[PDB]
Amino acid sequence: TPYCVADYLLDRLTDCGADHLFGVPGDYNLQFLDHVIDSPDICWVGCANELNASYAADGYARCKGFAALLTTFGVGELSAMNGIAGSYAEHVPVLHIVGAPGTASQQRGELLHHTLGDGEFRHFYHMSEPITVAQAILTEQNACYEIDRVLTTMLRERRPGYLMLPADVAKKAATPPVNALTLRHAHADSACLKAFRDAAENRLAMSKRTALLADFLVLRHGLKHALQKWVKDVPMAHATMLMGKGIFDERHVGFYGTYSGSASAGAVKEAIEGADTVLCIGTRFTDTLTAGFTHQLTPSQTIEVQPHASRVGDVWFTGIPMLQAIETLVELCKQHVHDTPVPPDGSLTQDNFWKTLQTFIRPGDIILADQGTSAFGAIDLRLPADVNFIVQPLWGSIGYTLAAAFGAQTACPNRRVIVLTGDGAAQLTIQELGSMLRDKQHPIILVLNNEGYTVLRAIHGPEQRYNDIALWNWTQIPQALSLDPQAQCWRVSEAEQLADVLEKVAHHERLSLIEVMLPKADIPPLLGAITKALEARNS
Amino acid sequence: TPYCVADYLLDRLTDCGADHLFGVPGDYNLQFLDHVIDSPDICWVGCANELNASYAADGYARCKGFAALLTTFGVGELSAMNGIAGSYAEHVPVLHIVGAPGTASQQRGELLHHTLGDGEFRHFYHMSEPITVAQAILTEQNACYEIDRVLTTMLRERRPGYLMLPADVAKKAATPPVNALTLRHAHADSACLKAFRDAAENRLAMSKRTALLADFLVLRHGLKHALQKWVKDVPMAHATMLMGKGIFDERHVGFYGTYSGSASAGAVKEAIEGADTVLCIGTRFTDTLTAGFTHQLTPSQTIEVQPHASRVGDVWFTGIPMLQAIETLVELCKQHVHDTPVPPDGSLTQDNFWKTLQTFIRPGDIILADQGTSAFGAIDLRLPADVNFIVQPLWGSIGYTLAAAFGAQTACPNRRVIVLTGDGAAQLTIQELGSMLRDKQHPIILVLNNEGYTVLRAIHGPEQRYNDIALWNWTQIPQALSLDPQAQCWRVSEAEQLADVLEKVAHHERLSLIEVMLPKADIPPLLGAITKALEARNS
Ligand SMILES: Cc1ncc(C[n+]2csc(CCOP(=O)(O)OP(=O)(O)O)c2C)c(N)n1
Ligand SMILES: Cc1ncc(C[n+]2csc(CCOP(=O)(O)OP(=O)(O)O)c2C)c(N)n1
Ligand SMILES: [Mg+2]
Ligand SMILES: [Mg+2]
């Protein structure tokens, strides 16, 4: 019962914004889990494996701004490694807690289970260094301030951190903090900010019209409000790329569609690439987001804002918080921007599938799309207001979407969750559907059944057997992963049928699994343009 | 069609003893897979996720002495890390091939999918260093001799290796080798071997009773044949530990049961620990194998043989191949060893389940038991001749057994495979059952349904909610993971029913899944002694 390091960690964890802890137990963390169970502030969420748990934590942090994952030493942590890496790649603040053997056992070099048999206990700690921003081995002498330093670094960088918690250290006495862990707002040096403002002001005084391109880093740094308000006060052509989709209400004036480099719609190209001044806010021009680096945006044409630095033309201004750079640009845009941007089929195909989905989505939806024709077709959806669109095109790990949806629904139990996963992707993390059923979640899961890896087929070897998959009976999965699923599952092959099923599952009273029958070679237009561009770089 | 680096690697793969390649495809390895498909010697086995493929490759190499795994850069390779780590811990030679972006893309530092977004392409290569014995990044300038070096080190050490294969490097021209990659037999220095022989002689000429203790390192180095011939030619009390189970036909004279430290049966304790000289051949005294390091074997009592060194009493003799140490001891034992070892219930319990399983096993069986009550009860089984008993008590990653069984069945399609997995463990790799169904395998899968993690319950917090799991509908799983399963499933709750069901499934005419209902608190005797031992070290 006495307050201890385990309780301190859980206290700090809630301060950061996580009300749940994902993971799977092991003998090295059971005593820590006692404090999780006993805590009135954090809810334990056992998952079906550690990889899914790390994915779910990622989806949770994309909804609540923070997440935590608990695994056991060695077998647990190394299983979650692909998940933490994806969190690092896409700037998701997920805390990895690793329950470990007591320090005396470690110092004695004992041949314990979950080790390499060499008596070494730091292999996996060091292996996790490239995919976290901060890390620590908690000791009796450092525990509380190493907890605080790692979590603070995660909050500042919006990226994963790692804590190793030996069983004995977790029971060490601690003191409840009077002060809650605070996200200290950084302020740039006044001269540096003025120098950035002066160069931006000179550049913005050049613009004949200005366009705004924002992406996922404004989502991670809690700047969604700022960019929405910014387009309101200064109406201009604005867009996101795939990663940042959902920043804006896509029905509003000034929005013409998602930007994907040369794969963009013609109206979008003129809106973004045709503007003489483009403001890039939190952008990363990855190969997928630019359809093979086919974006036409010169440095002199752009003003770029990143988490700790901003660029005007060829000059970088470092040590400037993203927020201040945005407030500067918003203030300057009220000065120099003056323009107003003048305020049902038979057989299912990709084209009519997404057309049907367009009529189904609603404000407040949480939409998750996996790599493949799912995410590459979802890019064409015109999202209404208050849509959380979760996609992972930089890391691109298939299977993330199904497990991340379990985490997202846990984060937002009162919101309608739409899961768009390919058949290939869903096989990698299928067991989390059981967790969804056990927790009585009601997402609308759409499995795109094209009988294999269609995006791989389009890239190379459509004929090749390695692009096939085992053919599952998708509508029967919930009845196997639950003793009383109470789900409603359909297998659809016509647009009429799909539209009717959508109205039936509209109010998500039960878990819904819709198996969508699609052709093997049918690809959305973004994938077509991606493969066309691949002719040059991949030969 | 021209012979190239991809063809060279596959040829070397066959030379090492692999007829299959496991993994999941990605755009960075599709062109390599074309050579896998076209090869008449190497068969592609697409898996449901990379973790399962790495587990399956481990199971494959435990049957054929070598295995290979193919993943895609970043998301594939990092998913398989827990499997490669288990292979390293238990000395299983699994080759990890990683398809990577072309060298030109990497050098340009491009923002590619499956990267961290930093332009760095070597993060994951270094992350895999602690869990491999050799690694290389193949270039146009090193590929064929780096392939040979890594595989050679894998063969010598019996441990995993890693190769990064850029797509452009795989297409580079190569030359078919005239000679096959050969496991050159190392030889000790004659004086060094004589020094060990003299010290062993001296000690062995003193023994009034001698016992032989062998374990998993004799399996990995292909010495199982040698050690059974040893006990045949020199009858003595012999045993293995859990990891090495299956080295000896356990029905032979001189065998009294598996050695597990203080958890051993009284006859086993007297047979091994009561001998004045015990020969430990390829042993590692891990916590599980010794029931909490409760083995009573003094250094003066033992002669120990390890892969590159052996010890007599307090003196180590390094640079001696295990084979030579064993041949010497065999020769010395025919001289100085003189001893002759004098030639149905109702409700299901752990006790009557293992008694029932004892009557079911046959020579030629492949038995896999996962961590938990499965592996801890399976240790009491009296194995007949020619049994491959696969268990992972050092790494101890639950979920390994189900996927490894798919690998073992692939290695041995004509052998009867019995999978003993807990309900918790099977949830981690369930998607591999789909792979077994797709490939028309016929394992006997026994799921120990005690409705949660019983071994964790035995350790701490039996009533705690963290020890619960989602309750699956096991008998319906094949019907969900296959459109037409060659499968039959049973649910049993009595010793009566299990015996009848095993009779029906005797000749493995189809895949059979038996849901065995067991009590939540029912524990095998080994687990009881382990938890009793935990009173001292874990407090
Ligand atoms: C973990 C992981 N393994 C492998 C890949 C390589 N990969 C990229 S797309 C793809 C196919 C996706 O298949 P599916 O979900 O069926 O999509 P669709 O048919 O809609 O394209 C694969 C295997 C990946 N992205 N992530
Ligand atoms: C990958 C992994 N995650 C977590 C653990 C921790 N662990 C050890 S035993 C165990 C319970 C296994 O449960 P089950 O398979 O049902 O076995 P049983 O109830 O028969 O003991 C767990 C979770 C582990 N060994 N491996
Ligand atoms: Mg598909
Ligand atoms: Mg169990």
Short mmCIF file of C-alpha atoms in Angstrom, two decimals, chain A residues 69-402:
data_model
loop_
_atom_site.label_atom_id
_atom_site.label_comp_id
_atom_site.label_asym_id
_atom_site.label_seq_id
_atom_site.Cartn_x
_atom_site.Cartn_y
_atom_site.Cartn_z
CA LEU A 69 2.59 0.52 -23.35
CA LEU A 70 3.71 -2.12 -20.86
CA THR A 71 5.62 -5.23 -21.90
CA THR A 72 7.79 -7.78 -20.17
CA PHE A 73 11.58 -7.83 -20.43
CA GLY A 74 12.91 -9.22 -23.71
CA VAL A 75 10.07 -11.19 -25.35
CA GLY A 76 7.52 -8.44 -24.75
CA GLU A 77 9.63 -5.42 -25.64
CA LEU A 78 11.19 -6.89 -28.79
CA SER A 79 7.71 -7.88 -30.01
CA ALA A 80 6.58 -4.23 -29.79
CA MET A 81 9.66 -2.89 -31.59
CA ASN A 82 7.97 -2.39 -34.96
CA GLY A 83 5.21 -0.45 -33.20
CA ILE A 84 7.48 1.90 -31.26
CA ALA A 85 9.53 2.52 -34.42
CA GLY A 86 6.40 3.52 -36.33
CA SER A 87 5.52 5.81 -33.45
CA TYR A 88 9.00 7.33 -33.71
CA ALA A 89 8.75 7.71 -37.50
CA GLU A 90 5.38 9.48 -37.33
CA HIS A 91 6.00 11.46 -34.12
CA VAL A 92 3.51 9.75 -31.80
CA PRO A 93 4.22 10.13 -28.06
CA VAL A 94 4.00 6.51 -26.85
CA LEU A 95 5.72 5.57 -23.59
CA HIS A 96 7.26 2.08 -23.55
CA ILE A 97 7.43 0.64 -20.02
CA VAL A 98 9.38 -2.62 -19.68
CA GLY A 99 9.01 -4.74 -16.56
CA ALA A 100 12.42 -6.23 -15.84
CA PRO A 101 14.08 -8.59 -13.34
CA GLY A 102 15.24 -7.11 -10.06
CA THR A 103 18.59 -5.34 -10.00
CA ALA A 104 20.27 -8.01 -7.83
CA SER A 105 19.39 -10.70 -10.39
CA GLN A 106 20.70 -8.46 -13.16
CA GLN A 107 23.95 -7.65 -11.35
CA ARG A 108 24.50 -11.35 -10.66
CA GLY A 109 24.27 -12.08 -14.40
CA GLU A 110 21.80 -14.92 -13.84
CA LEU A 111 20.64 -17.17 -16.69
CA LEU A 112 17.02 -15.98 -16.55
CA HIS A 113 14.16 -16.57 -18.95
CA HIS A 114 13.67 -13.86 -21.60
CA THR A 115 17.44 -13.31 -21.87
CA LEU A 116 19.99 -14.25 -24.50
CA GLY A 117 21.62 -16.59 -21.99
CA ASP A 118 24.74 -14.40 -21.75
CA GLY A 119 23.93 -12.72 -18.44
CA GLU A 120 23.49 -9.39 -20.26
CA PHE A 121 20.45 -7.30 -19.39
CA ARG A 122 20.97 -4.12 -21.43
CA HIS A 123 20.89 -5.50 -24.99
CA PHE A 124 17.25 -4.59 -25.56
CA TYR A 125 17.56 -1.19 -23.88
CA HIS A 126 20.32 -0.22 -26.33
CA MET A 127 18.44 -1.77 -29.27
CA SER A 128 15.57 0.61 -28.58
CA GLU A 129 17.78 3.75 -28.69
CA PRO A 130 17.30 4.62 -32.44
CA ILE A 131 13.48 4.58 -32.10
CA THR A 132 12.95 6.67 -28.93
CA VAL A 133 13.83 10.22 -27.99
CA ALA A 134 14.55 9.56 -24.39
CA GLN A 135 15.32 6.60 -22.29
CA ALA A 136 16.19 5.41 -18.89
CA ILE A 137 17.01 2.50 -16.66
CA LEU A 138 15.18 3.35 -13.45
CA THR A 139 17.22 2.82 -10.30
CA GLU A 140 16.52 3.40 -6.64
CA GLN A 141 18.71 6.55 -6.94
CA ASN A 142 17.34 8.14 -10.11
CA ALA A 143 13.81 6.90 -10.60
CA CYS A 144 11.56 9.92 -10.09
CA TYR A 145 13.61 12.43 -12.02
CA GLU A 146 14.37 9.97 -14.81
CA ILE A 147 10.62 9.37 -15.13
CA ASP A 148 10.07 13.14 -15.32
CA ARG A 149 12.92 13.79 -17.80
CA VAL A 150 11.81 11.05 -20.21
CA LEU A 151 8.14 12.07 -20.16
CA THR A 152 9.06 15.75 -20.56
CA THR A 153 11.22 14.95 -23.57
CA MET A 154 8.35 12.94 -25.08
CA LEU A 155 6.00 15.89 -24.58
CA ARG A 156 8.46 18.31 -26.16
CA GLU A 157 9.40 16.17 -29.16
CA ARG A 158 6.04 14.32 -29.59
CA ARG A 159 7.89 11.03 -29.92
CA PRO A 160 8.28 7.75 -28.00
CA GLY A 161 10.26 7.17 -24.84
CA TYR A 162 11.40 4.04 -23.05
CA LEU A 163 11.66 3.20 -19.33
CA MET A 164 13.08 -0.01 -17.89
CA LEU A 165 11.48 -0.75 -14.50
CA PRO A 166 13.15 -3.50 -12.44
CA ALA A 167 10.67 -5.19 -10.13
CA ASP A 168 12.54 -4.05 -7.01
CA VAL A 169 12.77 -0.41 -8.14
CA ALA A 170 8.99 -0.17 -8.72
CA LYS A 171 8.41 -0.96 -5.03
CA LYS A 172 10.84 1.72 -3.80
CA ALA A 173 9.27 4.46 -1.68
CA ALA A 174 8.34 7.68 -3.45
CA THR A 175 6.46 10.88 -2.61
CA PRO A 176 3.31 12.04 -4.42
CA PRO A 177 4.11 15.26 -6.29
CA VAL A 178 2.30 18.45 -5.36
CA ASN A 179 2.83 19.74 -8.92
CA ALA A 180 1.56 18.06 -12.10
CA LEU A 181 3.92 17.39 -15.01
CA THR A 182 3.68 20.50 -17.16
CA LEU A 183 4.25 21.05 -20.90
CA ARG A 184 6.44 24.14 -20.58
CA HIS A 185 5.76 26.53 -23.46
CA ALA A 186 9.11 27.47 -25.01
CA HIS A 187 9.73 31.02 -26.21
CA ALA A 188 12.19 31.94 -28.92
CA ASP A 189 14.79 34.60 -28.37
CA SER A 190 13.18 37.91 -29.33
CA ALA A 191 15.92 38.80 -31.81
CA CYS A 192 15.72 35.41 -33.56
CA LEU A 193 11.92 35.52 -33.81
CA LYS A 194 12.11 39.10 -35.10
CA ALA A 195 14.67 38.03 -37.73
CA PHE A 196 12.38 35.22 -38.85
CA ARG A 197 9.39 37.60 -38.82
CA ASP A 198 11.26 40.27 -40.82
CA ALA A 199 12.39 37.79 -43.51
CA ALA A 200 8.91 36.23 -43.69
CA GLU A 201 7.32 39.68 -43.83
CA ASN A 202 9.57 40.68 -46.73
CA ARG A 203 8.71 37.42 -48.49
CA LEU A 204 4.98 37.68 -47.74
CA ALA A 205 4.97 41.25 -49.11
CA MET A 206 6.05 39.58 -52.39
CA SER A 207 3.11 37.23 -52.69
CA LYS A 208 0.52 37.71 -55.41
CA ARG A 209 -1.54 35.08 -53.59
CA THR A 210 -0.47 32.78 -50.78
CA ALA A 211 -1.41 29.14 -50.26
CA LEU A 212 -1.20 27.06 -47.09
CA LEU A 213 -0.04 23.43 -46.98
CA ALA A 214 -0.15 21.77 -43.56
CA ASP A 215 0.56 18.21 -42.48
CA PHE A 216 0.90 15.75 -39.65
CA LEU A 217 3.27 17.73 -37.41
CA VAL A 218 0.60 20.32 -36.66
CA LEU A 219 -1.58 17.40 -35.51
CA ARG A 220 1.12 15.98 -33.23
CA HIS A 221 1.89 19.40 -31.67
CA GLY A 222 -1.77 20.22 -30.92
CA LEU A 223 -2.00 22.99 -33.51
CA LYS A 224 -5.17 21.81 -35.27
CA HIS A 225 -7.13 24.78 -33.90
CA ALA A 226 -4.51 27.29 -35.04
CA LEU A 227 -4.50 26.24 -38.68
CA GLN A 228 -8.29 26.02 -38.86
CA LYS A 229 -8.64 29.44 -37.37
CA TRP A 230 -5.94 30.71 -39.65
CA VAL A 231 -7.77 29.84 -42.86
CA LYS A 232 -10.93 31.32 -41.42
CA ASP A 233 -9.33 34.68 -40.69
CA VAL A 234 -7.29 34.62 -43.88
CA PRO A 235 -9.20 32.64 -46.52
CA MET A 236 -6.67 31.11 -48.90
CA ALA A 237 -6.19 27.95 -50.88
CA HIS A 238 -5.20 25.31 -48.35
CA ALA A 239 -4.52 21.59 -48.43
CA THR A 240 -2.90 18.80 -46.51
CA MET A 241 -1.07 15.72 -47.65
CA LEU A 242 -2.18 12.20 -46.73
CA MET A 243 -0.53 12.16 -43.29
CA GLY A 244 -2.08 15.45 -42.22
CA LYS A 245 -5.56 14.71 -43.54
CA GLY A 246 -8.21 15.87 -41.07
CA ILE A 247 -6.53 19.14 -40.07
CA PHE A 248 -9.11 21.02 -42.07
CA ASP A 249 -12.84 20.72 -42.78
CA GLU A 250 -12.63 19.73 -46.41
CA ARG A 251 -16.01 21.22 -47.38
CA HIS A 252 -14.89 24.78 -46.55
CA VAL A 253 -14.02 27.39 -49.16
CA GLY A 254 -10.36 27.31 -50.18
CA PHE A 255 -10.07 23.50 -50.05
CA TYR A 256 -9.78 21.68 -53.38
CA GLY A 257 -8.52 18.23 -52.35
CA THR A 258 -5.54 16.50 -50.81
CA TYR A 259 -2.11 17.30 -52.24
CA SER A 260 -0.11 14.35 -53.57
CA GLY A 261 2.49 15.98 -55.79
CA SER A 262 1.91 15.25 -59.46
CA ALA A 263 -0.86 12.80 -58.47
CA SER A 264 -2.97 15.69 -57.15
CA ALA A 265 -6.14 16.77 -58.90
CA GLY A 266 -5.58 19.53 -61.44
CA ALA A 267 -7.44 22.04 -59.28
CA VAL A 268 -5.18 21.17 -56.33
CA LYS A 269 -2.00 21.60 -58.37
CA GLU A 270 -3.02 25.14 -59.25
CA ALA A 271 -4.16 25.80 -55.67
CA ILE A 272 -0.84 24.75 -54.13
CA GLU A 273 1.85 24.40 -56.80
CA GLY A 274 0.46 27.34 -58.76
CA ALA A 275 0.73 29.77 -55.86
CA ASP A 276 3.81 31.98 -55.87
CA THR A 277 4.12 31.69 -52.07
CA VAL A 278 3.33 28.41 -50.30
CA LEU A 279 3.40 28.12 -46.50
CA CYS A 280 4.42 24.56 -45.56
CA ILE A 281 3.51 23.93 -41.90
CA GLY A 282 4.82 20.68 -40.43
CA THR A 283 5.37 19.02 -43.81
CA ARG A 284 7.48 15.98 -44.71
CA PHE A 285 7.62 15.28 -48.44
CA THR A 286 7.90 11.49 -48.37
CA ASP A 287 7.77 9.35 -51.50
CA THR A 288 4.20 8.22 -50.86
CA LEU A 289 2.88 11.69 -50.01
CA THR A 290 4.43 13.17 -53.19
CA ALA A 291 3.75 10.21 -55.53
CA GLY A 292 7.46 9.58 -56.01
CA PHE A 293 8.92 13.01 -55.16
CA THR A 294 7.00 14.61 -58.02
CA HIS A 295 6.07 17.74 -56.04
CA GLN A 296 6.96 21.01 -57.78
CA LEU A 297 7.79 23.38 -54.92
CA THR A 298 11.03 25.37 -55.01
CA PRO A 299 12.73 26.69 -51.85
CA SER A 300 12.26 30.32 -52.93
CA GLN A 301 8.55 29.56 -53.37
CA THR A 302 8.14 28.19 -49.84
CA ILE A 303 8.07 29.16 -46.18
CA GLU A 304 8.52 26.05 -44.06
CA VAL A 305 7.74 25.62 -40.35
CA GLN A 306 9.16 22.65 -38.40
CA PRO A 307 9.03 21.80 -34.66
CA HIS A 308 12.18 23.75 -33.65
CA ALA A 309 13.07 25.78 -36.74
CA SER A 310 11.54 27.68 -39.64
CA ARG A 311 12.82 28.52 -43.13
CA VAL A 312 12.20 31.45 -45.48
CA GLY A 313 13.66 30.86 -48.92
CA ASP A 314 17.22 29.59 -48.43
CA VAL A 315 17.63 30.87 -44.85
CA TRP A 316 16.94 28.80 -41.73
CA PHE A 317 15.90 30.37 -38.41
CA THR A 318 16.54 27.81 -35.69
CA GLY A 319 15.40 27.86 -32.07
CA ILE A 320 11.87 29.03 -32.92
CA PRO A 321 8.92 27.06 -31.51
CA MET A 322 6.38 25.93 -34.11
CA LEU A 323 3.61 27.79 -32.28
CA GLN A 324 5.41 31.14 -32.37
CA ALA A 325 6.33 30.69 -36.02
CA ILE A 326 2.66 30.03 -36.78
CA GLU A 327 1.42 33.01 -34.73
CA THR A 328 3.96 35.14 -36.60
CA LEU A 329 2.75 33.86 -39.98
CA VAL A 330 -0.92 34.31 -38.99
CA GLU A 331 -0.22 37.90 -37.97
CA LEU A 332 1.73 38.53 -41.17
CA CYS A 333 -0.95 36.93 -43.34
CA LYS A 334 -3.54 39.40 -42.06
CA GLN A 335 -1.16 42.00 -43.56
CA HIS A 336 -0.29 40.73 -47.03
CA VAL A 337 -2.93 38.19 -48.09
CA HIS A 338 -5.79 40.14 -49.67
CA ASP A 339 -7.35 37.58 -52.04
CA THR A 340 -10.67 35.75 -51.74
CA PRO A 341 -11.06 32.26 -53.34
CA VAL A 342 -14.57 33.22 -54.60
CA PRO A 343 -16.92 31.64 -51.95
CA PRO A 344 -24.89 4.09 -57.62
CA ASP A 345 -23.56 1.16 -59.67
CA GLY A 346 -23.77 -2.60 -60.00
CA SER A 347 -20.65 -4.65 -59.32
CA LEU A 348 -18.35 -3.18 -56.67
CA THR A 349 -15.23 -1.36 -57.87
CA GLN A 350 -12.68 0.86 -56.16
CA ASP A 351 -14.25 3.93 -57.80
CA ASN A 352 -17.81 3.25 -56.60
CA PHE A 353 -16.60 1.88 -53.26
CA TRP A 354 -15.09 5.25 -52.31
CA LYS A 355 -17.99 7.14 -53.86
CA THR A 356 -20.28 5.13 -51.59
CA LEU A 357 -18.08 5.79 -48.56
CA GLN A 358 -18.14 9.52 -49.36
CA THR A 359 -21.87 9.64 -48.63
CA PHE A 360 -21.48 7.62 -45.42
CA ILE A 361 -18.89 9.61 -43.47
CA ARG A 362 -20.11 12.11 -40.88
CA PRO A 363 -18.67 14.81 -38.60
CA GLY A 364 -17.03 13.30 -35.52
CA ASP A 365 -15.91 10.12 -37.30
CA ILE A 366 -12.57 8.49 -36.54
CA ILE A 367 -11.39 6.96 -39.82
CA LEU A 368 -8.42 4.58 -40.05
CA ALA A 369 -7.02 3.36 -43.39
CA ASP A 370 -4.21 0.84 -43.86
CA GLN A 371 -1.44 0.92 -46.45
CA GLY A 372 -2.65 -0.43 -49.77
CA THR A 373 -5.71 0.46 -51.81
CA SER A 374 -7.36 1.42 -48.50
CA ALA A 375 -5.22 4.43 -47.61
CA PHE A 376 -4.50 5.25 -51.26
CA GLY A 377 -8.22 5.50 -52.03
CA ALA A 378 -9.20 7.10 -48.75
CA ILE A 379 -7.06 10.09 -49.79
CA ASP A 380 -9.87 11.12 -52.17
CA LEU A 381 -12.50 11.42 -49.41
CA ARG A 382 -13.73 14.98 -48.73
CA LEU A 383 -13.68 14.92 -44.93
CA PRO A 384 -16.30 16.96 -43.02
CA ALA A 385 -15.54 18.77 -39.75
CA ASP A 386 -14.17 17.03 -36.65
CA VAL A 387 -12.88 13.99 -38.50
CA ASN A 388 -9.87 12.19 -37.06
CA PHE A 389 -8.21 10.51 -40.08
CA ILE A 390 -5.53 8.03 -39.01
CA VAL A 391 -3.05 6.82 -41.64
CA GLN A 392 0.59 5.69 -41.47
CA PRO A 393 2.20 6.32 -44.88
CA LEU A 394 5.71 7.09 -43.67
CA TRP A 395 6.36 3.95 -41.62
CA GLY A 396 3.75 2.03 -43.63
CA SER A 397 3.32 -1.12 -41.52
CA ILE A 398 0.29 -3.11 -42.68
CA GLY A 399 -1.81 -4.44 -39.82
CA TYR A 400 -1.42 -1.20 -37.86
CA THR A 401 -4.92 0.01 -38.73
CA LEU A 402 -6.95 -2.82 -37.17
#
